[PDB]
Subunit: 249 residues, 4 copies
């Protein structure tokens, strides 16, 4: 019988490439999404057209709140409801915007940035583990985590927390046979609306090819980590950054 995976933030971009590859490898998938309702439903349709009832959608805000634990438990439950099992979790959804130290309130920025990047991953991990052979979790981290963007303290705090979770949960879930790893993009899939000039400014920095990663290149590292070729790999974060994190100021 086919394994099943939850991908958070799977409607668009990297999340979508990850769900597509997982599906192409034989997985059934829960396409989680927040606002991108048309993209998610149409993705699930494209995949079900390929193989009947191998995709379902699941909408949820992953901002930190009193209701997040229940929401995360329901995302995991949706995988069991659809597919009767949950073998892989990909924590991909992420809020990303600056939060300078000097019209959202700060407590909302905290809830979105720390919720999506760290707290929701933790809660989903808890539910994933509680509801349980090649089980694993892949967390989407950030290659530049130690050379942070200016004014992005909460985002960066969130991504650091996520490293912490990857390690802590690898240690704690190893006895249940659940591996926990990360993939750390550098710059990938620059926004379509971003001017090519500014796109080129990031591209120029990348040693390998002076270009951004494709979403599929990030997905490839995920597929490796969930494969049986990574059976002894846990607590590892693989950078897929074309050398960007190695470049000094």
């Amino acid at each position: 019988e086919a394994p099943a995976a939850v991908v958070t933030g799977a409607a668009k971009r990297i999340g979508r490439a990850i769900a597509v590859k997982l599906h192409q490898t034989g997985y059934r998938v829960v396409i989680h999404y927040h606002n991108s309702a048309e993209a998610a439903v149409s993705l699930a349709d494209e995949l079900n057209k390929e193989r009947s009832n191998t995709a379902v959608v699941c909408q949820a805000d992953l901002t930190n709140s009193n209701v997040l634990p229940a929401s995360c438990e329901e995302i995991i439950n949706s995988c069991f409801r659809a597919f009767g099992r949950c073998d892989v979790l990909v924590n991909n959804a992420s809020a990303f915007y600056p939060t300078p130290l000097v019209g959202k309130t700060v407590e909302t920025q905290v809830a979105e940035l720390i919720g999506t990047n760290a707290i929701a991953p933790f809660l989903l991990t808890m539910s994933f583990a509680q509801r349980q052979s090649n089980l694993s979790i892949v967390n989407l981290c950030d290659a530049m985590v130690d050379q942070p963007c200016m004014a992005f303290s909460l985002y960066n705090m969130g991504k650091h927390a996520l490293v912490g979770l990857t390690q802590s949960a690898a240690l704690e879930l190893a006895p249940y046979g659940i591996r926990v790893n990360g993939v750390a993009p550098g710059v990938s899939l620059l926004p379509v609306a971003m001017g090519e000039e500014e796109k080129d400014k990031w591209r120029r920095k990348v040693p390998l090819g002076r270009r951004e990663a494709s979403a599929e290149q990030i997905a490839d590292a995920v597929i490796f980590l969930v494969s049986g070729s990574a059976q002894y790999i846990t607590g590892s974060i693989i950078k897929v950054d074309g050398g960007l994190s190695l470049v000094h100021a």
Copy 2:
């Protein structure tokens, strides 16, 4: 006059030693506390008996909530209110307890709010309030030397301390053009609870390469004192381990 420091969770243990040492160095201090009211007031008295009008207490819960930013703003306000200035922030207060992934009384939302609020979000908000109000200005965050070899079942605590490393770096970078340095001190195992079982105390002490003992609270304070001093004026975004080699020891 004399510079002023805020020390969070300053009523007892390591925070208290840092307050004591900053006060001996010539600082006026805000002793923040949450539950340890007696110990706090008793410390303020002792420090004011030593030099009058040089310590105050400030009570606040540093659990995450929608009012945490106001509470952090009021802490930095209480320093200006009492001393006219705020030169040093020490982010020391911290909740620490297990939060297993596979199953007190506490709800997980409470665990999240306490562990992530005290270790990460309040430091961030206090750092904002500190910078917004603004010499040798700096912030010191109490990190954890064991943050990449975490205690079993301490996920949220570890996520917190990892976040605090990220804040230390992000705020060092962002606040440098305001001449505010941001650094960390990372203890290994330090000041074991007097009430902890002797067998367990020994098990911790035996692990430490340098002297087979825990750090004193004073030893931790010494590194804080260095980082706020004029001998550390080019130092920002650095985290100094004060761990006797503990983090170096393999399984």
Copy 3:
């Protein structure tokens, strides 16, 4: 036409597992060895029975000396001689033994072997690899997951492996414009000597979170195979731990 790979120290154990997996993936292989002549020739024998004229052995000492650069150049030259090309270099050969700081081999010999095999030879093979150049060119270095929790009295071994991390990063950066990717694989504990004590092996096995066992040679090789493959086209300067969580475990 099949790509070609050089594997250092490939007569046995992890190096052999890597050579075999590359060969099955379609590569022609140079099996480098130092003392294990019989094991190397035998491996090349097998692989040639599988596909003729797809393996050769190459003998070299990788101890540091004034001729080491020529020896490394001759290793790379030996791939071009046998196969007309050299696509992949795996730096796997390694001396490993204690070198205590306080007290047959002279310390000069210790430095030469430990720093030579683990770091300088990899640097010189990388130079010759780049100099002697469709393509998916890369280098994989066999690193060590426990590099920051070192074994007692293994200073020179640990310095070597740390230098290898530096090389991995430095070469990733510098050879990126040439299309040459440079990455690492960092085993924890893998392949215990058949005649290590039943107690000593079990002591190592029990430390490992994931399965309480050492990695197989195949498992290390799997990670090498990924990094050389087109599934890793954007990955350079990455070191993948393959350690079953061992590096995360505090003492």
Copy 4:
């Protein structure tokens, strides 16, 4: 009795500042030098002017070779012979120049860069320990070790090995009460031997003050680490970089 310190490469620049500051703190010093004979002697003269019989010189090449262990043993010996004890070792001497992967022979470059930055520190550490209060060793590391300068492979390899030594020796010498730590400068003391497009270029990247560190600021960290205020600190590397290592490309 006054404690004694060996400082390698102490005739000029950061090494000289460390010797001065240690001497100012009450140490007797051995001033090691390789080529800067006039400056070394001038410094010893100046410190002995302050306090008689508190400074001596020792000459040695720290390039790797068959004679380097004996050379390192004699450096430590010069401290015992002059002063009757050796409480502090500062490994500061360092060769630094580009060694492109694609003049000196390569093997000479290896000997120099790996010898000064790693192997001499290791041998000096063995000699120091073998001859044994507040004993410690401070290794001058590099804050930019993970974002290395282009074409500086051997130098970066040497500095990485030095981190390794720092950690390994911290662990192994802890039972003898010998602490082992590091100080990692970012940019410090730009030569007048440097264009000012180039100097300005480096200065402009430093978040804290848009300037290099003074040699004295580097020395301040060494002083702290050797002091009684760092009694529990071992295996720690303190960056003194004005935040340079945190600045992304």
